[PDB]
Structure 1
Amino acid sequence: EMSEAIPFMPKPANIDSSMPGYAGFDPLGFTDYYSAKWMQEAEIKHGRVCMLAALGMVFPEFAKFPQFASFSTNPLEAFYQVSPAGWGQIFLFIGVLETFSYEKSFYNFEGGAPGALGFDPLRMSSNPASAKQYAAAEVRNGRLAMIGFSGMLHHAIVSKQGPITQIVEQNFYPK
């Protein structure tokens, strides 16, 4: 049996079609050494943070909250323009949200599905076909947001502006 993603390599033994974004892609066999379900949970959390981060790098191009209206549209400067009381409140809120993952991982590790923090308020994923599609879509949009945020971060390092601004001014290359 060979891997779907890299057809000339053998299939990575510890990933399976059961996993939503499975492509058979583990050329360096991380799952051969680390727990596949731990890696699965880490990829989903990184994707969820990145999906918000990719929207966050883009969104104050359009509109800013009135209090932070004076803040810069380059995200890497608006990071330092926020007060430490504000960053402390963000860190506390992320801490409160992360207590549930600290309780899921490290205590009931084997009970559930990777990334399942009991957050389904609109009762989606009830229909099985919808649940299948949403599982794969969350993984794929999370991976895309990881790549996209990685891009936009380094683009803000080179051109000292945000994504849309760099595009509009056509500042695509190191000046």
Structure 2
Amino acid sequence: EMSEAIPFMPKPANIDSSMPGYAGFDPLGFTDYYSAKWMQEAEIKHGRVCMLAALGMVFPEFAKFPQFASFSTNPLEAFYQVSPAGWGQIFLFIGVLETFSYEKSFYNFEGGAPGALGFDPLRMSSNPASAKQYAAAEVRNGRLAMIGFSGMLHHAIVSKQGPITQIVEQNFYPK
């Protein structure tokens, strides 16, 4: 058996086609040492955080909330312009959301599917084909958003602006 992503290497033993974003890609064998299901929960949660984060790096280029209308469009400056009461409320809300994941992992670890936090209000994924397409699409858009946010962050460090402003002004290289 051989890896599909890397055709000359053997298949990583602890990943499987059942997992939505499977490509056979584990060259440094993290799953041979760590739990494959813990890695999947971590990958899915990192992906959701980076999906929101990539949208958040781009969105105040277009429009800002009226309260923060004076705040900067470079996100790394708007990070410090927010008051600590605001960041405390953000941290508390994320903490409330993370209680459900703290209860999912560490207590009923083996009951369910990775990333299944019981959040399906619009009742999608009922159709099996739709469920497959959405599972793989969530994984791939999460990975893409991870790469995209990492880029956009370091670009905001170099050019002291946001993504769109940087592109429009063609500030593509260190001045």
Compute the TM-score of the two structures, normalised by the length of structure 2.
1.00
Distance, in Å, in 1 between the alignment partners of 2:79 and 2:11 is 43
> How much has 1:160 moved relative to structure 2?
0.2
1:126 is matched with 126
> How much has 1:118 moved relative to structure 2?
0.0
> How much has 1:130 moved relative to structure 2?
0.1
> How much has 1:64 moved relative to structure 2?
0.1
SS at 1:137 equivalent:
helix
Superposed CA offset, 1:23-65 (max 9, x none)? 0000000000000000000000000000000000000000000
> How much has 1:117 moved relative to structure 2?
0.2
> How much has 1:133 moved relative to structure 2?
0.3
Root-mean-square deviation (Å): 0.2
Distance, in Å, in 2 between the alignment partners of 1:38 and 1:118 is 17
SS at 1:25 equivalent:
coil
Distance, in Å, in 2 between the alignment partners of 1:55 and 1:22 is 25
Distance, in Å, in 2 between the alignment partners of 1:108 and 1:171 is 49
> How much has 1:88 moved relative to structure 2?
0.2
1:58 is matched with 58
> How much has 1:151 moved relative to structure 2?
0.2
> How much has 1:82 moved relative to structure 2?
0.3
Distance, in Å, in 1 between the alignment partners of 2:139 and 2:145 is 10
Distance, in Å, in 2 between the alignment partners of 1:130 and 1:13 is 28
SS at 1:23 equivalent:
coil
> How much has 1:89 moved relative to structure 2?
0.1
> How much has 1:155 moved relative to structure 2?
0.3
> How much has 1:104 moved relative to structure 2?
0.1
SS at 1:67 equivalent:
helix
Superposed CA offset, 1:97-133 (max 9, x none)? 0000000000000000000000000000000000000
Count of matched residue positions in the alignment of Structure 1 and Structure 2 = 175
Compute the TM-score of the two structures, normalised by the length of structure 1.
1.00
> How much has 1:68 moved relative to structure 2?
0.2
SS at 2:19 equivalent:
coil
1:4 is matched with 4
SS at 1:113 equivalent:
coil
1:70 is matched with 70
Distance, in Å, in 1 between the alignment partners of 2:131 and 2:69 is 39
Moved over 6 A (4+): none
Aligned sequence identity (%)? 100
Distance, in Å, in 2 between the alignment partners of 1:133 and 1:4 is 20
1:79 is matched with 79
> How much has 1:143 moved relative to structure 2?
0.1
Gaps of 5+ in 2: none
SS at 2:9 equivalent:
coil
